[PDB]
RNA sequence: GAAACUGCGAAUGGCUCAUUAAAUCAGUUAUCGUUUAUUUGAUAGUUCCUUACAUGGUAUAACUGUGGUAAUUCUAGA
């Protein structure tokens, strides 16, 4: 229970964790009268003059002395490129908060001026930034976290096309901050790199997805990298207020293919499933429908391989996600189910069938319930009793309005001698509940 | 429970208020300088009485006493800035020999009449209080303004007025609108 | 396609020109040139040609004019911005054409071309006053007759190369365009003795 | 009255605050604290009437509750805290330290102060005593109790105190020929070397002081405050260095 | 003929309340009394802050006219504006809302009545309701 | 976040000069003759010592309900 009903006073306390949990990153979600984009004699010089007025600290005053003698114009910046940057990096490594605000703003704007020539300072700029952020962990300051990650967002935004072309080196740089063992570091770094992921086109995106799945199998033992990748991709898809967009459906297609390859890790398939879970909980069905089309399309493309259990994993996630309120057509889902069954020609099958029995539509179950229980009776033969106990625990009255007793009797007639102890355990469970009197009523071989 | 602002009486009736010589004196002063009040003449005579009393006491004190030097130099420079005491008379004896005609000549309506923005002293008074005359940038409409020397060079008509500047007054432009409509009919 | 990249491109061409001029001078330096082109902005004298001048051979040329009693001259010289990088002059048909504007007691304003430092000032265009611009009220604030009617006395050319403004004993102050010498605006001084003596 | 007063009229206030006599009836009664009532500067007077960093008492509350003001190393949030004489008031966002010290005209004086000088603070050892469990301490002129002093520290002797540890760095004896600041009385703000302590018994010991233009005056031992040796003030004096002129 | 000319003096960067405080001299010849809305727009354009950050108050036209001297404040963000401004000035500039309350006498009289009621009141209300119901 | 318990404040402020002629008061002293909420700075390992400290016990308010009375910032029983 976070602070929900605001009070009448004006100055709340707002502890540090509350401020971080309130904090987000996107300055394009934000907006104001941006001074550096507003006045244009030189971006660095405009921001420098505003901060010379605003800030009165010893460290920024010394920096102001040096570089105020150096820069007054754009060829002066373009010539003394190295001196300015090394002085900036010197004071950021001096690590003083009162001066840490304007130097971060100036680093962003200095890159904006020095655009496609910044790519030689860019690496150790990022290094000093992440060292600053770990120092900020040591001295808790939501201000410092907000400034530093806004500087990273600005650098990504200003050098979009080049880092997009070279995406795998950027995440190779940010993995010490993406897989960091703090929830907010992984959250913010994932949001920034998520903006770049949204900006990237399809081919470099495919390369990046393949590389990051390989890196996740490398960090099999790590779970916080998994969580960081999850929050990264889900924000790249969800980025708007209620509607994921066309870049999100393209991202979903790329992730679907490169996860349904026979080389991708099943942990990465679980990551794809959790991404789909977050998206299904977030977005509405009108904005969701083309993503559903893409998913059904890619299922029909690659349904026939050694990836059938993998398809089953993603499909169980789909049918579970929230309810039928996000699912367009259980008829198409039924076609997929029969396709997967005919291709299979176990436990996940029982889970899928139980989730379909509980969550799907009765108007489709009226014509699929025969084939469903026949698929269960054929394929998951030993598992059918476990499936039936799970179904009765999830929703008993649905199968009871349907034909649970008859299919149970047919299963008993077909097979009783292999798992009679399992039969006894099932009946031993179903005695105590007063809601299974038809199961108390059923007949025997 | 506030602190009291201080007020002060600016004039003072003389000892014998009815005396033929002083009545004709004030008639001469009022008609010559365009005044309106024994109140105004007593205002100036009270200021001059205070000044000459201070100067007399600084005379009676010892020469090169620091009290005399300090207060006498301050009094002399204030009078010189007013313009009543000239440059070459920078002494407490001439401060003793000043008079009401000097002060009423440093007033503003006398300066406007003397510089020639007005035909008479009463015309000068009317101009000032109709807000036509500025001293530098500031519109003054007080006929007892006591200019200094630099200000005395700076007196001129005001940029708001119809006389040294913008659009004519309501009488002129109403007459012009009337003549325009009468030529239209 | 981005304005920051356009500024960077103009600055890079400027730096190419600086390195080439440093090489031709050689047949430190670039840093000093940049510090100079900024150091115009600080208020200290820096331009130090006090002894490089050769006055003993300074070539002189009188040019006699037609009207009588030139009163003032102001010459417009186009320079280059350092913040943006286009030029000082407005049009593209000028490209740094040194102009001069002269005003004369004959109520005549005249623009000469002086772009060449060997030939004489060539009279490009002119505009003359006269007595048809005398105000009909003569006693009012309105003095906005489009010409000059008595004794123009000072000229000044705007640095953007669009306007040149002239003022004289007629207590007006007229801003003329720089091409057709057409009077775009006329501001009375609104004073009976407000004669305009010198502009800057 | 049947108890302690809580209000101060405007004209009742100490004169050296330079409080103008029309902006109200009450002046910030300085809360009980280290310094006495008639020689203390509340933080509202300092921040508003002197630095002009605030326009209202509500802005002084905003500053202090934002926790910017530190008085002798520690954060204060009471707007009428009695910041007295020889004080260190650091504003961090403005990067300034202020030694509060008197001027020649008898008023308090902002003194801009660097970090290495703000790190310490003088204090006039005024009561040396033996406390419980047999430990000795000194009581300086701002209530600061410092256990375990040097054995040579006596009454009326200056002690330079390290602030961030509350400890005694060193001390300056009271002999003739030291540099003496005068704090109360007619001559307050006149820095002069002490010539002779005229000492009476049961009365008040007067002190004959002679300053750099070799002018001589007399004050009391209560108003005398030792700064340092001849020509070596331990603190940085304000402009004019405490010399009364004509 | 007319061009409002704004100049600022005594620009004190006050980083404690995150603002810049100055003194605005307005010259408006052949005109009167430029609006605080217009001054806030123009000061926002000058100082590159937002109009919601800029605040001005206390203007005074001189005798004769043509000049009015005042005061201004420019916060470093609209967030700092909403944090440090007074509520009456936020009401002026339209940021906050003018809350609706009863007059001083009405509030004090309701205070005195509720001061005379002890407890919540509802058991007493049931008691006197059935009492008058007898 | 109402109510009520708890803590603090209500001893300041505002008004008036009735009384009082070494009394109040003004200037000057003393407390080596006493109390002091608050503010500020310091301050308290006591290890053991014969038969729960991962933390003892009672109540009462507000509240639910039953009432009295012409009536009050009245209150009773449970």
Swiss-Prot record, chain B:
Compartment annotation: Cytoplasm; Nucleus, Nucleolus
Residues recorded as bearing Phosphoserine in the entry: 183
Residue ranges of domain S4 RNA-binding in the record: 106-180
Disulfides per UniProt: none
Cross-link (Glycyl lysine isopeptide (Lys-Gly) (interchain with G-Cter in ubiquitin)): 179
GO molecular function: rRNA binding; structural constituent of ribosome
Annotated region (Disordered), positions in chain: 159-185
Any one GO CC term of the record: cytosolic small ribosomal subunit
GO biological process, one term: maturation of SSU-rRNA from tricistronic rRNA transcript (SSU-rRNA, 5.8S rRNA, LSU-rRNA)
Quaternary structure note: Component of the small ribosomal subunit (SSU). Mature yeast ribosomes consist of a small (40S) and a large (60S) subunit. The 40S small subunit contains 1 molecule of ribosomal RNA (18S rRNA) and 33 different proteins (encoded by 57 genes). The large 60S subunit contains 3 rRNA molecules (25S, 5.8S and 5S rRNA) and 46 different proteins (encoded by 81 genes). Interacts with snoRNA U3. uS11 interacts with MPP10. Component of the ribosomal small subunit (SSU) processome composed of at least 40 protein subunits and snoRNA U3.
Family, per entry: Belongs to the universal ribosomal protein uS4 family.
Protein name per Swiss-Prot or TrEMBL: Small ribosomal subunit protein uS4A
Source organism (scientific name): Saccharomyces cerevisiae (strain ATCC 204508 / S288c)
Gene label: RPS9A
Curated annotation (Swiss-Prot), chain C:
Highest taxon, organism lineage: Eukaryota
Location in or out of the cell: Nucleus, Nucleolus
WD repeat start-end pairs: 147-186
Family to which this protein belongs: Belongs to the WD repeat RRP9 family.
Function comment: Involved in nucleolar processing of pre-18S ribosomal RNA. Required for efficient pre-rRNA cleavage at sites A0, A1 and A2, and biosynthesis of 18S rRNA.
Comment field on protein domains: The WD domains are required for nucleolar localization and U3 small nucleolar RNAs binding.
Subunit organization: Interacts with UTP25. Component of the ribosomal small subunit (SSU) processome composed of at least 40 protein subunits and snoRNA U3.
Miscellaneous comment as given in the Swiss-Prot or TrEMBL entry: Present with 5130 molecules/cell in log phase SD medium.
Name of the protein described by the UniProt record: Ribosomal RNA-processing protein 9
Gene designation: RRP9
Full protein segment contained here: 57 to 287 of 573
Swiss-Prot record, chain D:
Record-listed Phosphoserine modification sites: 31, 246
GO MF entries: RNA binding; rRNA binding; structural constituent of ribosome
Signal sequence bounds: none
Binding partners and assembly: Component of the small ribosomal subunit (SSU). Mature yeast ribosomes consist of a small (40S) and a large (60S) subunit. The 40S small subunit contains 1 molecule of ribosomal RNA (18S rRNA) and 33 different proteins (encoded by 57 genes). The large 60S subunit contains 3 rRNA molecules (25S, 5.8S and 5S rRNA) and 46 different proteins (encoded by 81 genes).
Protein name: Small ribosomal subunit protein eS4A
Compartment(s) where it occurs, according to its Swiss-Prot or TrEMBL record: Cytoplasm
Source species of the chain: Saccharomyces cerevisiae (strain ATCC 204508 / S288c)
GO biological process, alphabetically ordered: cytoplasmic translation; translation
Its job: Component of the ribosome, a large ribonucleoprotein complex responsible for the synthesis of proteins in the cell. The small ribosomal subunit (SSU) binds messenger RNAs (mRNAs) and translates the encoded message by selecting cognate aminoacyl-transfer RNA (tRNA) molecules. The large subunit (LSU) contains the ribosomal catalytic site termed the peptidyl transferase center (PTC), which catalyzes the formation of peptide bonds, thereby polymerizing the amino acids delivered by tRNAs into a polypeptide chain.
Keywords: Cytoplasm, Isopeptide bond, Phosphoprotein, Ribonucleoprotein, Ribosomal protein, RNA-binding, rRNA-binding, Ubl conjugation
From Swiss-Prot, chain E:
TM segment ranges: none
Cross-link (Glycyl lysine isopeptide (Lys-Gly) (interchain with G-Cter in ubiquitin)): 20
GN (gene name): RPS24A
Disordered, as annotated region: 101-134
Function summary: Component of the ribosome, a large ribonucleoprotein complex responsible for the synthesis of proteins in the cell. The small ribosomal subunit (SSU) binds messenger RNAs (mRNAs) and translates the encoded message by selecting cognate aminoacyl-transfer RNA (tRNA) molecules. The large subunit (LSU) contains the ribosomal catalytic site termed the peptidyl transferase center (PTC), which catalyzes the formation of peptide bonds, thereby polymerizing the amino acids delivered by tRNAs into a polypeptide chain.
Modification sites for N-acetylserine: 1
Keyword field contains Ubl conjugation: yes
Family listed: Belongs to the eukaryotic ribosomal protein eS24 family.
Protein origin, superkingdom: Eukaryota
Subcellular location(s) per record: Cytoplasm
Protein name: Small ribosomal subunit protein eS24A
One GO CC term on file: mitochondrion
Post-translational modification: N-terminally acetylated by acetyltransferase NatA. Also partially acetylated by NatC.
UniProt GO MF annotations: structural constituent of ribosome
Extra information: There are 2 genes for eS24 in yeast.
Modified residues (Phosphoserine): 13, 55
Description of how the protein assembles with itself and partners: Component of the small ribosomal subunit (SSU). Mature yeast ribosomes consist of a small (40S) and a large (60S) subunit. The 40S small subunit contains 1 molecule of ribosomal RNA (18S rRNA) and 33 different proteins (encoded by 57 genes). The large 60S subunit contains 3 rRNA molecules (25S, 5.8S and 5S rRNA) and 46 different proteins (encoded by 81 genes).
Basic residues bias: start-end ranges: 104-114, 123-134
Principal subcellular localisation of the protein: cytoplasm
Gene3D superfamilies registered for this protein in UniProt: 3.30.70.3370
């Amino acid at each position: 229970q976070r602070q929900t009903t605001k009070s009448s006073k004006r100055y709340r306390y707002s502890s540090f964790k509350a401020r971080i949990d309130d904090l987000k990153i996107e300055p394009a979600r934000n907006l104001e009268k941006r001074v550096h984009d507003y006045v244009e004699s030189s971006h660095f010089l405009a921001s420098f003059d505003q901060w010379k007025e605003i800030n009165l600290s010893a460290k920024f005053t010394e920096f102001a002395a040096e570089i105020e003698h150096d820069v007054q114009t754009l060829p002066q910046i373009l010539y003394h490129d190295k001196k300015i940057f090394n002085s900036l990096v010197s004071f950021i490594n001096f690590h003083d908060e009162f001066s840490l605000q304007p130097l971060l703003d100036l680093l962003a704007q200095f890159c904006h001026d020095l655009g496609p020539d910044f790519l030689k300072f860019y690496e150790e700029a990022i290094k000093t930034l992440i060292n600053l952020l770990d120092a900020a962990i040591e001295f808790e300051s939501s201000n410092v976290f907000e400034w530093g990650f806004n500087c990273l967002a600005y650098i990504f935004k200003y050098l979009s096309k080049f880092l997009v072309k070279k995406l795998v080196l950027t995440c190779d740089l940010l993995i010490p901050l993406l897989s960091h063992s703090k929830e907010y570091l992984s959250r913010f770094s994932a949001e920034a790199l998520s903006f770049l992921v949204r900006k990237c086109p399809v081919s470099n995106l495919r390369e990046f997805v393949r590389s990051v799945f390989e890196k996740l199998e490398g960090d099999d033992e790590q779970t916080n990298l998994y969580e960081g990748l999850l929050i990264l991709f889900t924000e790249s898809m969800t980025s708007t207020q209620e509607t994921l967009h066309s870049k999100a459906k393209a991202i979903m297609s790329v992730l679907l293919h490169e996860a349904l390859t026979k080389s991708s890790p099943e942990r990465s398939v679980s990551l794809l499933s959790d991404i789909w879970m977050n998206i299904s909980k977030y977005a509405s069905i009108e904005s969701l429908l083309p993503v559903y089309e893409v998913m059904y399309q890619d299922f029909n493309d690659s349904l026939d391989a050694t990836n059938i259990d993998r398809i089953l994993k993603v499909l169980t996630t789909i049918v579970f996600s929230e309810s039928g309120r996000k699912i367009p057509d259980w008829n198409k889902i039924t076609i997929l189910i029969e396709r997967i069954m005919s291709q299979s020609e176990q436990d996940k099958v029982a889970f899928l069938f139980a989730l379909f029995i509980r969550n799907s539509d009765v108007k489709t179950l009226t014509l699929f319930h025969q084939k469903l229980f026949n698929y269960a009776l054929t394929n998951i033969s030993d598992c059918f009793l476990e499936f039936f106990q799970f179904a009765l625990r999830l929703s008993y009255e649905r199968v009871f309005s349907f034909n649970g007793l008859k299919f149970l009797q047919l299963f008993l007639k077909k097979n009783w001698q292999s798992q009679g102890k399992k039969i006894a355990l099932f009946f031993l469970e179903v005695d105590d509940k007063p809601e299974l009197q038809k199961v108390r009523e059923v007949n025997f071989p | 429970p506030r602190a009291p602002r201080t007020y002060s009486k600016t004039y003072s009736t003389p000892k014998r208020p009815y005396e033929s010589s002083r009545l004709d004196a004030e008639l001469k002063l009022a008609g010559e300088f365009g005044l309106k009040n024994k109140k105004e003449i007593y205002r100036i005579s009270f200021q001059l009485s205070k000044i000459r009393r201070a100067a007399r006491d600084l005379l009676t004190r010892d020469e090169k006493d620091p009290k005399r030097l300090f207060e006498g130099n301050a009094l002399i420079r204030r009078l010189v800035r007013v313009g009543v005491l000239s440059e070459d008379k920078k002494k407490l004896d001439y401060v003793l020999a000043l008079k009401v005609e000097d002060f009423l000549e440093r007033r503003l309506q006398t300066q406007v009449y003397k510089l020639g923005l007005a035909k008479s002293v009463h015309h000068a008074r009317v101009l000032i209080t109709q807000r036509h005359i500025a001293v530098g940038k500031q519109i003054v409409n007080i006929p007892s303004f006591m200019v200094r020397l630099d200000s005395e060079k700076h007196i001129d008509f005001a940029p708001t007025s119809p006389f040294g500047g913008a659009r004519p007054g309501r009488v002129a432009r109403r007459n012009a609108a009337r003549k325009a409509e009468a030529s239209g009919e | 396609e981005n304005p920051a990249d356009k500024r960077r491109r103009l600055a890079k061409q400027y730096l190419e020109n600086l390195k080439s001029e440093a090489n031709d001078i050689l047949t430190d330096i670039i840093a000093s040139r940049l510090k100079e082109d900024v150091a115009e902005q600080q208020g200290r004298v820096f331009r130090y040609f006090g002894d490089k001048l050769l006055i003993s051979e300074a070539k002189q040329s009188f040019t006699r004019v037609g009207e009588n009693n030139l009163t003032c001259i102001s010459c417009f010289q186009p320079v280059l911005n350092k913040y943006t990088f286009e030029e000082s002059s407005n049009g593209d048909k000028n490209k740094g054409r040194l102009f001069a504007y002269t005003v004369s007691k004959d109520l005549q304003l005249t623009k000469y071309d002086i772009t060449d430092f060997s030939k004489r000032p060539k009279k490009l265009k002119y505009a003359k006053g006269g007595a048809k611009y005398i105000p009909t009220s003569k006693h009012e604030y309105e003095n906005t007759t489009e010409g000059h009617y008595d004794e123009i006395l000072t000229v000044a050319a705007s640095p953007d190369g669009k306007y040149v403004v002239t003022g004289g004993r007629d207590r007006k102050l007229i801003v003329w365009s720089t091409e057709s010498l057409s009077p775009v605006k006329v501001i009375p001084t609104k004073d009976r003795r407000g004669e305009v003596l010198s502009l800057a | 009255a049947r108890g302690p007063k809580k209000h101060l009229k405007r004209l009742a206030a100490p004169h050296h605050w330079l409080l103008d006599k029309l902006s109200g009836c009450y002046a910030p009664r300085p809360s009980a604290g280290p310094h006495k009532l008639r020689e203390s500067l509340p933080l509202i007077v300092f921040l508003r009437n002197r630095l002009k960093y605030a326009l209202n008492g509500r802005e002084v509350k905003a500053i202090l509750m934002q926790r910017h003001v530190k008085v002798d190393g520690k954060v204060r949030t009471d707007t009428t805290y009695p910041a007295g004489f020889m004080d260190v008031i650091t504003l961090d966002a403005t990067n300034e330290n202020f030694r509060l010290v008197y001027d020649v005209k008898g008023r308090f004086a902002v003194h801009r102060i660097t970090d290495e000088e703000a790190s310490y603070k003088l204090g006039k050892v005024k009561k040396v005593q033996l406390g419980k469990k047999g430990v000795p301490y000194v009581v300086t002129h701002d209530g600061r109790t410092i256990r375990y002093p040097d054995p040579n520290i006596k009454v009326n002797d200056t002690v330079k105190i390290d602030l961030a540890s509350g400890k005694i760095t060193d001390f300056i004896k009271f002999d003739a020929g030291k540099l003496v600041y005068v704090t109360g009385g007619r001559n307050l703000g006149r820095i002069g070397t002490i010539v002779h302590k005229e000492r009476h018994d049961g009365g008040f010991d007067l002190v004959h002081i002679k300053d750099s233009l070799d002018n001589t005056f007399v004050t009391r031992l209560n108003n005398v405050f030792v700064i340092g040796e001849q020509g070596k003030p331990y603190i940085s004096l304000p402009k004019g260095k405490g010399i009364k002129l004509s | 003929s007319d061009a409002v000319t704004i100049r600022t003096r005594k620009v004190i960067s006050n980083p404690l309340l995150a603002r810049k405080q100055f003194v605005v001299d307005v010259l408006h010849p052949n005109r009167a009394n430029v609006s605080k809305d217009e001054l806030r727009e123009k000061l926002a354009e000058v100082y590159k802050a937002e109009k919601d950050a800029v605040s001005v108050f206390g203007f005074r036209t001189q005798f004769g006219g043509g000049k009015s001297v005042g005061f201004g404040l420019v916060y470093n963000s609209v967030a700092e504006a909403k944090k440090f401004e007074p509520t009456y000035r936020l009401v002026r500039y339209g940021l906050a809302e003018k809350v609706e309350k009863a007059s001083r006498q009405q509030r004090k009289q309701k205070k005195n009545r509720d001061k005379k009621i002890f407890g919540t009141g509802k058991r007493l209300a049931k008691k006197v309701a059935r009492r008058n119901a007898d």
